[PDB]
């Protein structure tokens, strides 16, 4: 599995793998920002960024958002394309249902290396 829940709370903040933090671009929580917080490397490194659907064809499989990399440590970043058919932004097939009636959905996301 792997994801890490990021939920659809205007203020909220995960990290990825220790490595990369991650917040809303604003209140329209449209898409996630990124911003590199694993040390300092000695080359740039790249990592995919994976999303879960929650309905639709596959639910098995991830889809991208992009890519990250650790040259993103000044500034927030959006995920670079793929693209090349891949989501911008959040749709409903990324939304998972919270637990608990009557809270925030979330969506599931993570990195894997860009290989
Ligand atoms: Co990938």
């Given at each position: 599995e792997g994801y890490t829940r990021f939920y659809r709370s205007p203020t909220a903040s995960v990290i990825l793998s220790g490595l990369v933090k991650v917040k809303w671009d604003?209140?329209?929580?449209?898409m996630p920002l990124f911003k590199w917080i694993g040390g300092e490397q000695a080359e740039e490194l790249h990592f995919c960024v994976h999303i879960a659907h929650?309905?639709?064809?596959?639910?098995?499989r991830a889809r991208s958002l992009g890519t990250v990399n650790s040259?993103?440590?000044?500034h927030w970043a959006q995920a670079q394309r793929?693209?090349?058919?891949?989501?911008?932004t959040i749709e409903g097939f990324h939304l998972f249902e919270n637990d608990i009636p009557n809270f925030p959905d979330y969506i599931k996301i993570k990195l894997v290396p860009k290989t």
């Open positions: 604003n209140e329209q929580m449209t929650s309905s639709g064809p596959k639910l098995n040259n993103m440590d000044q793929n693209s090349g058919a891949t989501r911008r």
